[PDB]
Amino acid sequence: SQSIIAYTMSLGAENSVAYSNNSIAIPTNFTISVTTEILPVSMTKTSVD
């Protein structure tokens, strides 16, 4: 069956980092990413008498 439910929103998932005074992490291989962005520039020219 289906229904409508109400709850309290969550913010994310815990990602506790392993911190010490002697350890470092270095990446080894890479990816290329392409994203998009949209921006309005103008509107319509109207005139009223």
Binding site: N21, N22, I26, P27, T28, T31, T36
Partner: protein
Amino acid sequence: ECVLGQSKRVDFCGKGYHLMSFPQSAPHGVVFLHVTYVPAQEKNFTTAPAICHDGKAHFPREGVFVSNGTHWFVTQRNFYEPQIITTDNTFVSGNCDVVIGIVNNTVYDPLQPEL
């Protein structure tokens, strides 16, 4: 700033390290395509701030010191590429008695085997 050059401002021309950007036109607007760079496939290493040779302290010129359990290397910060420590990628300043965490190793000099 994004199309006619390369930007250093964070999160301005996309999310990541900026490489390029391309424009396109839309009715009453513009569209930008941002091309960036993302790291991946991290690993684990042990680090030290300096290396104490005989009475001298050596600091890395452009990279960082790492270890794989038994041997020490110097690598660049954004990509894993280990190289043998020499006198051409380190510089000397002082003696190994003031730095906290200085370790022992040897530094290879690329002149003695020549003569």
